[model samples]
Target: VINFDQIFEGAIEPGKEPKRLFKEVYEGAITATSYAEILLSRAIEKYGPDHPVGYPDTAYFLPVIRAFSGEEVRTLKDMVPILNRMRAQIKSELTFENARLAGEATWYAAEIIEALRYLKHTPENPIVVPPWTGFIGDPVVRQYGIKMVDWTIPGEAIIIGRAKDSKAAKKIVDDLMGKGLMLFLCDEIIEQLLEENVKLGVDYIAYPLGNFTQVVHAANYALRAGLMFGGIAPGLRDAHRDYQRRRVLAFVLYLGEHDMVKTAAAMGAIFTGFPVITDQPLPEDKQIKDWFISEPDYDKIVQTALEVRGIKITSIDIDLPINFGPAFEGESIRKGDMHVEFGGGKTPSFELVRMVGPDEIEDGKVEVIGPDIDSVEPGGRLPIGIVVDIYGRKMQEDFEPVLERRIHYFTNYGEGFWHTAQRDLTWVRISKEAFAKGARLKHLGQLLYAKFKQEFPSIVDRVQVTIYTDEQKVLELREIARKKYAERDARLRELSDEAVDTYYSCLLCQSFAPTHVCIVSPERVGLCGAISWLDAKAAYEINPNGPNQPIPKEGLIDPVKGQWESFNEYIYKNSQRTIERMNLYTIMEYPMTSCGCFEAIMAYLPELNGFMIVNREHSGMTPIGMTFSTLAGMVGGGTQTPGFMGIGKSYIGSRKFVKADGGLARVVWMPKDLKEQLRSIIEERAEEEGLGRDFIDKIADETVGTTVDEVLPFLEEKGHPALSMEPLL
Candidate 1:
């Protein structure tokens, strides 16, 4: 399938090192393919053609093979044809394109070998050996898919082999980590990183795949990203390639020595348009323009990697003694090692941010009213009151809560500090190490001041923060904070779907789910549970061309389902004309489609004459015969599936939660954790709907049963009104 004449159109005819490298890999791959084919043939002869083969829990069967050849490999015999075809495709051609296909063919065979080995093991004794485990499954892909598109993960770096010096390897990884790049390690680099004490996991976005041929994990990762998020269907080879090239910002860094197989693997990477940078020497002819490079300088390697992919490093300049990034946002601080703790259950701590007029606040002023970290004893509690006053001509009272909610995020970005909850219930902890590094309470204020100014310069002109650690002052201010919180809560409650002339549209997930558009109204927040209607409005005011936009509510199509004609038209145009009409308040008919970022899923439980709600945090099966993961697979990817819809957890409290169906009384089941988490709010909503105080008590949880028959008796025993209500379908 390669045009040798066109590819080598102007190049020299002989002795090119790049061509030699490509040839070496092609030969290695051909040999590997022959060996795999022989092994597969012997397996089929011994175990019969019906023997099963595949990685566990993967929806896509033999991803690379299925993705490229459009063939489903479920049995030993099913792969024979694909393997043979791959063998046939390997040629003696020295052109990069031809050898790249051979590399692709090589991986198909390699994956087959890896997958077949797992077939011999029992389910209880899953394949546990390393460097041979095959394809990354759909579950893993779905888990990390969102971060890739949102730039929370900017790019992926495939670090192969150990650098000539361990220090050089450390420098490269540190630079990538500083730039917020996802790290994929293979071969000896894994040991090097471990030796260097680099954190490797989904948490750090650094995965230590394996040591040898397991480097193909990176390729599988890119392929699955396309399949799950890019809307690239299996067997659509061109589409997969295009999606990977354009959307997957991944590159290769070859360290130390290399061989024919490694060079062929490099070709496979280049086929996906991931440029390569090698520390080893290469001839000028082998450089192959910007696609492959021979950079001996380890200091400039990370920069070179960024440049080839056209990825700009977004640097955060927080004036803190420690690192600052969203990577540390999930770090937890236990009481045993706590240096100083504030407000979480033991003490009264409140954080409040208010929009003030220009005359009411001093610009860039940070005042600390209590003892600094040095003055406070280690492991002491501080009853702190953080009050942030901001001034902006464009800011509103409605934006106050939205900005206030981000205080947890801004404060937690510091390396050794941990923050959780919000408002009066806020808890903050500074680790012993962070405190030892001269971190003070004022640094928290400084972080807020800088982040606010940097992130919201269009709205916020000046920000003044006052930190109060005095117990009496905190308690006195806590009363005022509670009142403000209540007022804000009440204000949000009063704002309804009908209160606004325009709703906000969130396309933040469009990078992943291109066809999904979140129509956020006052009655509903974004499905991700991150952006509110007010937040969207503020975002639009800050950047008109940003993800959030204003959708004028001028055309009403179906008031019952909350479908507006103009809104439908806008979504249609934005969704690449895939989604036509969608209901904002209903799930049974043309419901809002999700882009895989939803906090919860609502599925119609026709057997119970209602619906089952499952939060993303729940892993247990529901009465409807599927776990949250399965339901998510059904409802996500921006495709509208009637009788199923994704929703924000907070939306359950909204009156618009399936209002077109039957509202709160229709809920039949939920996870115990979710039910307890939202118990108070659900009770309040039920009370407002005149469903009595015990409405939430009627809902069945995982502890009750995971099947409809079991839940039916419980619901009927509890006098659940869903059984008495009209059928959901």
Candidate 2:
């Protein structure tokens, strides 16, 4: 056996044992014996299989119990010391990527189990689906026949999370109570609870949230914000009421760890029909408070809970802390440069443009949506308009007059009509006279933004007022809009007969998330939700050799509707897998190399062409047989390289070329042991080329895992068909 210890350098330090912390870290926490027991238990429970378990699923269950256990223990004792040990153990034991994946799996499993149970129990009737995201003012609850009064539909739900102060929370609760929407709360609202001591309270007290936690914590705050105002809500109502004919039960997933009692109290507001409250904790606030109060008020808790839900709670206040307030606001400036914003425009007087179609983008279509656009664009900038989607009678009654009045002020022309478009969509464009009214163009836009916040206070937050003033600024905005699209072009790829196609390609992602080939569609972005079609198209257009360039679709159409069709015609013509003119789309017909960065990949034995894949991204070369540096040399800088593998322009603008595939293909990598040995040798050679030992090692780490054995399979298993490694081997 090779002396692996030598590669690790001196395992033993001065006055230290030969087995250092590294060895301990390698062994991981949660003793091997404990793991074996868990594996066996899961096997017996799930498949009733006998105890030979070292599968990924077996490893997954332990964290669930561990998290739940942590929560319980935290309620009684100081969690820092104990949780610190667990977190350290978790960190030291698992890779960051694995830990995140595990967390997702855990959440997914719980939800699935709950869903299965729900389906079995409520299979007879259909439930309403909530509008996922859109423009507010489209339609109100009255459109869905919901009276906005005391009616608790089974699955219909709402969550009242976060408050500036408990006093404010109490006020919102009092205001919303009796209206019939069940709310959720954490233990922080004891002040509110004590006051409503006699009423049955909230549905469930969520688990402990760290500092200022909110349910579904702003995963995509903007998306969530849009959901509140977007047409999707009314769509959900229509779908539910018209077809499904059932109440939608809302599952309030309160995250945290606490005892049963504390957990209940965390959901106390929704449980006790009381207002939920929270202490104003923030990300920046470091000082911890003495929130753990001893056992005291039981009767008040029970009565309030009974008053809220008409019965006693399944649990009570034991040991739980509620965290809420706001984001860490420091120095009156945002901490991060990339300000991730959520929510957009709500106008008071002007109709806000919730949706704008091709009329906005088509050349010379200068018709703006709102009054300000017509007024402001006389100098020849594109006219921008604000259109409003009206909701309930209250909104129409209250807002229509305001809209007409505001429109009249802009009337150099004397008429406005509320034209009908799609039932869910309404079109609002400014009149020609509105533009000439110079008195209130700028003020009109500002007024509309302010009005949106006032009228639709819950939904509208941030406003991106798009006005076409300068061509240069519009170009810059185009770049901003296409940032995510470019990334995709840089990563995904496609093969085609196009001389611009070919070169190195990777399909490694297939190993993980199967059946997912990230297609670049004009409107539909990838599953990762990063790259867009426009981004890929632009990249292909710019530099063919660069990341997003396209492969030429030269091959003629084959047996009807095959890859020869538009879909794979472009892909098969340009990727590395093509020999002369073979199609790469058909799995049984013309298979391509699977890249390491694919959403998933399959790794069996690491020899004899180590791996094969499909083209995914446009940038970077595959390691099937060649080095990245060598390929870069072959494809010089230009719009399109002159080779079977040559692409058009920079890699950013192509339908054929993809960025993700290249990134993924390069990452399959070898074992760390073998890679480190190779790095040592590469460093010696590089030393003559001005590459320092440190720099060489760093490059090696990035290209291959820092080990020698890891890279052995690619070297040994790969036969002559794969790229020759004779220079090194």
Candidate 3:
């Protein structure tokens, strides 16, 4: 067998029985390509002859084909040509170049194949759970995109196959991720790393990407990255390839023995300029120059690919006992998992930044004013005040508040620490595992110290964190923080909806979804969730002819319900005349319209007498028996659905939110985590509108139920205010 290569003579050239990798790739290509043909046929049969296919809210139409061949593959019939192209690339030429071409063909087929599965079970049912993260949605793409774009992430590395040593799999991932490589674990290696108790998907790093051709997701992700970042037109293969080659720094690590299909996928990766490294040895003649790497040493394997690929880690590491990454940003420590917690609906928690005199700050000093995590029991709740003092040559009073926001980003990066909302509503939790791991209250300030220094080295000369966990100490400082916040926002109240002479319209998501327009008052935010009245005002200031333009308030309209004569006229003009009127406040009827890029959906639970707020990323079902995606169809696309609407995330926090329909009190159901995200603001409104501070507890979540039948009993038991309020109908 070892000397068989010397005797091979299947083709015209001697020893031309096709190189080992090429032979397998070619075989894989036929299998992969043929399979896609049949799969698309089945998909067509299932959805019927004229069924439309596309990812929800994804602006790109089957981006794999769009970016690769610059073709639209929205319908099953349209994919027929792509399938033919996949077949044509599967040449039988028994050569390395032919193998690579066939492999590229297989990748396109994999996407077609991937599309078939998605087209079958999709909308929201499968995307919410794991096993396969199929296509990267535009929102999630953009979430990690800015970082990926600017090299905040050095590169994305896909780890596939089972490891020779299961523990070594974790070692490879940990070591690579530690050295600043963005990672995604695919196939058997996900279990390998997980078996070693490795934490994955921390701030979107080392994401587990499921098995088999699901590994193909990353290829499409890169294509989108190139397509989105370069603004490269589809089918412009030259620019697409060139953009990925320069803008991308990804590599693939095949941990175990390669198979035909896997190697075929590997060839497709090289097309995107990503090199592949494997622990298995390869014959020198069959090796891909600068890409198909061979390494037997596990210790140096992680570094070998980056070295051969010439990728530098532009690294930054913060010193703490626990792991930290933006991947941890959205992780939540549930009630049963917490060792101790602060804020949320349970306690008084707030964070503030003070611009102290140059002599006042001792850089990197972290002081805990009360008992630390060492003394707290599991599931304990406490009040805390997190105060940061900064002194810098360039520090302004404005810089203090801006830097204050970093606390949310920094605190959640810890392994077991989680944060939600901000400022007075700041809720933080620490998992029992973290407390067991010796994470103390002192680490909170230390975390603040290091990251602030790491992030704002230019604006900050010195930084200090002073944390108060004692109820008395916290209350004292919290009172001072209250006044500071109140004083700071004294002008904010000045810009009420009734007081503003004008509102601004955000027609940004227009042109694409032409029937949409969101007009923002002083108390309202644009539906995209990016522009507030102040932001819109500033935007108008920067460019009066830009997206955000002003409309003066005039004529008779429902003031309690957010409707104005000038706003109605602006809507008709701006929304291409498809939509006529939109009531900004109430969801009962004529609720404001929004495009697919909505931050959240406001659905009226008719049986529950209140509305359920489901955020865009909260994949679970609402009490109205709808998941975020299911509700997305009902409320999105710039249509004025009477009982439902897609509203900005911050809109729920505003005073004018559904003012005509009894506002926040009518919100009796939402995602538990979403409520926590806006918990502070909800509590403030609850108390302000005489709903009392405990009103948030009355709101049902999945813990109550996703159906009206299940949620009604819980709401009645909790004495939800919506039950006593006027009938929403």
Candidate 4:
């Protein structure tokens, strides 16, 4: 209504809150781009263009960049043009869509700059410095992948910035863990938990990670799954976004009032299909449905996040003083905090699970023969015998050890209860915290009884626990259990592929990778490593309508390749018809397809004339200039790639492993820890194969070198048998 001269004189009113947010985000993107451009040239000059770049132990080279830009950036020079493109995305206008695009620029710019920072610091290539490692390995991703696929971990959430108070932070952290949500923290958010002395990352339900731009590690972790399990190759941005929306089920929880950079980061996440939840409410005009959520109540944050992400959880309602779940699976109680110890070579302890007829015993009984925790002094030790008696409608004696092994997990699930080893060598420690919370010997029995009933109702009609703490009774039961243990070992040794005509199939990862099918043979276990031939049989009998199905070896196709006519048909039909054939004993041809949960992968090193074995726990680069994470993308997600096979670690020790090829003589390299883990079996197998009992030493490990070019001398010096073996190529 005013004239042009009057309007020019008048004060220009500040625009709506939305305009301010967009302006800051857009400017932040421009700043982030400018910063990385300056750093890139300096990095190139100092470290040279070829200076190796990427997160330590991480396989996917700057996953967000590869997924978003559909390009590669492994060197300093490679980052230059990417930053140029990122800078070009910054628009002068401050519209909603334009701001989001700026965020895309912001994310890529930060990723480049952060990757450059890695070049700045090394501390001489240290494994860790504690409390700051977003240098997350690919193994951690697959580790969480299995859980999320199994519904053990419902979804993932990243907490950015800082909470208002330590109490609120602790409560929020506790609530998140209690709900079993996989958590990743950024900035001072981890500091908030550290102040409360709360437990942090341990490769599990919670990953309290590094600061600032390191928050992108969570995004990288999530994005790689599309590359990993979804088999959506890099450069498929639209497909990656859809996979994130459907399968990832992740969100961001920004604590406190956000900054311009945070707004920029937030837009990047939204572009990737992960919504945001802020403690501060957006202005009424600024709110945009489910994508922008605001909840002020700390108590309701977890619930609101879960609801928004559409994640459902299954929790046990067992009565106990302390927390319990797979989240505490690896929780350890130190000796300094121990109230009592058992079976850690400090005292004799053995546990056994036996099956008897249904009519012989009463159900739901938990008893102890000796004095409970209240009677023992603090730090006292006790000799113990834990015996679980079961009577089921469908259970067999073979299923006894299967259910018994689960006792370790059931006990470890308790917060202050620590369990390691099994059978006669149970090293259990009950921390003072749990004792103060009223944990007793009787509680162990009750916990076991309830868990057995709840976990295996199909096979466990009724169960009872009797803890023998009396030294005399413990000694008596220990001898009896040893006999059963010896009997079981003999049976395990005699069981082979030829011993059974009917093998089972494991589709446990069907939801994760639809086309993946696992053929479980006595000689060859499933790729997941959890399902042995016996375990698969047990599951099949327990639930015929489940993931496992029977596949009879109908016709002989090739004995050495371990292929049957019926096996081919079964895989062709069951693998959603994607895979036509697979070999059970060889990787030279259509080898078994992996569901991305394999324990290890073996890549044929043609230059070395054998294979290099790398496990999921190993994060370093292999001899092939790639890590397990990189190879996982190649052979994982139920895709068959000859000369590369995903397998259980146990398969390396199998007599039929790559039988059509060279077998045990063909293994040239493996990780140090994995080599030692399978050392005894490997030694024994090598001796039987005429490779000598000292053959393990001939196998190269990381200590020798990772690249084939580097590890070459080590293998030759050791006079490795694979060097003289047939040409793999």
Candidate 5:
């Protein structure tokens, strides 16, 4: 219903055609309103009115429009009326997917544009991202990535990779030429390039992958860009840049196999000013077994696919007979009209039969055959397949050297296979010739690799691209696979854009603590160092309002010096499933530091009773009370265990120092190393909370401790005076 009698709702412009702009604005509002209505309506149809599953305007849609118009009001009183009206209209139109897509499109457009705008004005800056080459041949990486990189810096273009593969390093130079970027290859790679007469590019090439080593490398690579370290921020690099000012391009690539710490520290130094950083693929020499352990379920495959955006289980098929052998023809490889079994033992033989039919017979062992279930039906086709299992009993003693020996194929096929020599614990890939002679080598590599990939994609990429090729191709095939390479690079960019919006995840650390919220941006992973922003994004997409979602940041803040936009948005979103709403910005008015599952905030109290320590990890609450696990439980039962909330440090910013109760939150209990990291944050918060800076400093000094023994009885008895009587169990 358009209002013909235009009443100026304080939306006035001192212009002759103010009405036109007003009408345009009004029409946009109408469109937005209709859009919101469609979303709500579809949601209502699926669930119902007052359905907890429904995504209200605050959960989505409204924020996008507000950002689009550059007119986000400070209060719900100013925005809710129009939003509600539009939601009503939307409820009458559209479907769930369409509404979600539209809403996400609008929000993403606004957010990226806003971030880009900020970037344009702020100058080029870089943030350290994970290794780039880790996704080689990765299907997901091949679809949605950008050559520009997931990280950005003060300068526009930079190419960074480890130094081990100088061949790939050379490819980067040619690829990045004329793009006017810096390619910072690690120092070791630079040495190889120089030794091989590969001209180092004009800009910087940091090497050795260390903070200072790479800094020296960057300094030497381009005399003009000056020298910069990996972990040093751009603000600190002004002196170096001032001296060089020659438009230096940063390029780094190197081997971090032995010196990963130095490599990371070095890379961290140059993060804020560079544009692109490509990490190396895991070492070529590493085996699939290297990526696994029985203790941890989220192994190589799961880590590899960490946060795959579109996680669709393409297919799940079981134990099909995968033949691994050289072409066999007129040999005794097959027996004439009889089951072939080796002599003198419980020889392995296979047969196929049907189950669950009128003609079905009870058999000790039968392998149902055919991809289609109807094939075995009464009036249908006969089914046939092979049954495979370890038929012989062998112990480690008998298996010995054979069990330990890994078969390396020198045959034309160039296959690697591991046989289940002893109880399927290890595999020894039989030589092709050995297998051709009918060696009864039991190997489950193919099946194991496939199963591992399906169950734990995040840990591993693909079992292994079993290739039958020469050493030349094995080394140079990267260049040969240019087509596949280009395709993968393009795809990574696409997925990165799709996954850039927002995530609030508390998965990795959730088991140890509860009531936690961790805001994940592209540049950051959780503090415990497991899930990335993309990982959280995928999790949230799989279950919106589940384990993860966007925290509105709406009316929850007092915007200290306008640092925050509004009081309610911040507080509401942060404590949405916990305390109804608590003001986060104004600590004096509404005090709540963070959700549970955080590294607990503890402080020394000489008076009240020993010291005040809050369990941010496992507890449902703290002195301030709202738990990350409890709030997260509203989305999913992620934190059901009593003492486990994997609350992260992102939400509260400084867990080391906190602002809660009537006093400054400071550390009273923690290991020495963690205390060191917490020192700055603790001091900063203490000053912010009106407590003296020395308050946190003193506590930090007092709490510095790490034990060499398995138990800390001494700490519990005397040195530690707070809740020491509790048993370790």
Candidate 6:
């Protein structure tokens, strides 16, 4: 896949001192490997060779060894064979490139060390073991998988070592997150970011993996992406390496002094096409242009990382007192720390943004009608309402709610600000820290003014925001906002797939899932659950050359199956001809492909004459004899697997939910959690299909059965309608 020797060809210079340095690092890796081997031997002696060796809650057994050797290290003895081979490969060589096998072996030993540490110790003992924990599994990948493909998370940044200045490190991470790059913190940088109060986890797409050798987890994460989404088979080293080089955009930033062990691990990263940027001065031979750079200036570290990785980062410029970026989006404002709270069922607060005539609104006009943040006492409540008036030549009423919904994200971008929900149910909080920094109600309006003009510049020529803090003004505006909310919901419900002459296409996932194209219609939302029909339309309007595009519905081929000749043409062309045709209504037929971000999977069970769906959050085994991870492995990566379709949870209640197969009556089983989450809608859809209120009880859940054999008896006992319906096959 990639010529590792050639890539690192010019990275070394012939010298006694340089050779000594390589030997030192190589010996350090070998020493670490020897120590781990002793630990593994003791563990096996203490608890037999047949004892299981793995991290908790992960399906992939020792991910690094599994990916490279294609060996499932289930028992302690199973690891012995791979570790022995890795030990033999670590040799002292004449050249640096020839000696990099030590780096690869170093990471393998590091993973085993971290895994065995957890065997005797629980997660609670952060002092005994490392605080970084161990192997991040399928659940974490699936959680952020969609964003990775859609380019919302443009790339990954692996920061190693402690920075000279903690403040400088924080700004570097802040800049990276501002550009939407996922951060993988390792070594002392983890403590640096934690000290800076930066929130880290899957929610922020930033993870503090661990310190020292735990940095190998970042490399393993990239490798797993190759095996899972790239369709590269494990043990196929060439293809695996190729996928890592081409698809996984990542870079490593080394801060402070360099050590032999850390340098060896960094070499392993280089083998996977991840360049290393160090702040320390290195020998002339060690520096290889963009591959290995030395940047002493902390201010330009983020820019250098982006340049080396070839990631183009665009950010919105906000004129506010506090720092603004997506990094702060995950910050929480506790009740005790709040400066003021709004609309959590405590006050009349609503946020509404609507389309208006050009003459009706002024460009960039942000007006605060009542008292600002300074007037409100700390920890007090405020009756607040945000009204945004937008005017544009291409603006339509349909896109109003779509733009309005983004206000939550816009407001949350500021540091110390937290926003959630939408419409009248919206809740917002600004921290006392932000208030002390001179944040006010006008800043909120300023945020919307800048983001709307930046994000939707095509359709938003004039933008004006009016914030009302007075009780009477907020109440009056709440009523008007409520009416618009209802009208928008009604309009959405009334729209059908056939009502539109064109459908929107979402290719946002084409980066990871190269062939998947989501055809978003009025009846079918995007399978990712983030994009709706109107959202796609607005996206197309904003950035015509972007992911969402309009596909004209020129030739209708089969109305019942929800297929069109023009749609086939578009799908064939855009999917790189991998998929010729797809159905919007049936799971048994050629169904929609997914990019691994689906909220749930609708898999038809022919034996029961219905479909059983499993959500991403549901980890238990379904009737199909597979967990969500197992099923997703087969259905995702743009593959069209018949009788299985990935879908958004909201699509379960849509009128077109397997419409060709008879809709709601075709569903036989779901997890009890999902059933309760969507209980009101599921019941309503059941009644519309002529099923009584008692029909919901008849749908077998995990509580009833985990196997098809177990589910059949429950269905028979409950007289489930799916059992009597037409055969699913």
Per TM-score, the best of the predicted structures is 6
What TM-score against the true fold does each predicted structure earn? 0.90, 0.24, 0.67, 0.91, 0.23, 0.91
Evaluate model 1: give its lDDT: 0.80
Q: What is the lDDT of residue 415 in candidate 5?
A: 22
Ranking by lDDT: 4, 6, 1, 3, 5, 2
Q: Looking at model 1, which ten-residue stretch has the lowest summed lDDT?
A: 2-11
- Please say which candidate is ahead in TM-score: 1 or 5: 1
1-729 per-residue lDDT for model 5 (tens digits)? 332112222322233322322232233334444443455455446545543321111211122233223233333232334355333432213222223223323322222222222222211342222221110111111111111112111122222234435565444443332122334444355455556533332212111222222232233233211111111122233433322232333322323343422332222222212211224333322111111111112122222221111112233243323222221100122222112221112222111111122233222222222232221222222111122111112111212122112121111111222223221122122233333333322223343334334433432232221221122332343233343335434743454312443334443322212233444444334433334455565555444555555543343133331123332344345433442333222223333332221233333333222223332223223222233222222222221222222323332333212223232332233333444555676567667756556654343221333221212333334333233322211
Per-residue error for 250 in candidate 1, Å, reads: 1.3
Spell out the clash pairs found in candidate 4: none
- Which residue runs of candidate 5 sit more than 4 Å off their true CA positions? 1-529, 541-546, 552-556, 560-577, 582-669, 673-729
lDDT per model vs. reference: 0.80, 0.27, 0.75, 0.81, 0.29, 0.80
Better of 2 and 4 by TM-score: 4
Clashes of each: 1, 152, 6, 0, 114, 0
Q: Let me know the TM-score candidate 6 reaches against the reference structure.
A: 0.91
**Over 4 Å off in model 4, which ranges?**
1-31, 34-38, 41-52, 90-96, 123-128, 358-362, 619-622, 702-720
Q: In candidate 6, what are the lDDT values of residues 1-729, reduced to their tens digit?
A: 345456555555556326544665687778878977999999998999998767654545676766766787778888787888888988877456645677678878888887776676545554233335345657677777776775667788888898887788788887787787877888787788779876676557677787776787787777777666665566776566667777788999988888877877776777667888998887754555566678888878778878878888766666578877655777788888999998889888999989999889989889999887787789988888999999999898878888898899888878878899989888899999999889888888898898888888778889999999899989988999999999988987777877878899998877777788899998788987888888898888777889899988877777888888887888899988999998877877788888777889888898898989889888688999888877887887788898998898988888888899988888889999999988988888888888886677888899998999999999888888888888968
- lDDT, model 3, position 519: 84
- Candidate 2: 10-residue stretch with minimal lDDT: 322-331
Which residues of candidate 6, in runs, are more than 4 Å off?
1-21, 57-59, 118-133, 165-168, 285-287, 552-560
Per-residue alpha-carbon lDDT of candidate 4 for residues 108-160, written as tens digits (9 for 90 to 100): 88788778777756657753456556656677777766677767777778889
Q: Please name the candidate that would achieve the greatest lDDT relative to the true structure.
A: 4
lDDT of 2: 0.27
**Candidate 1: how large is its RMSD?**
3.6
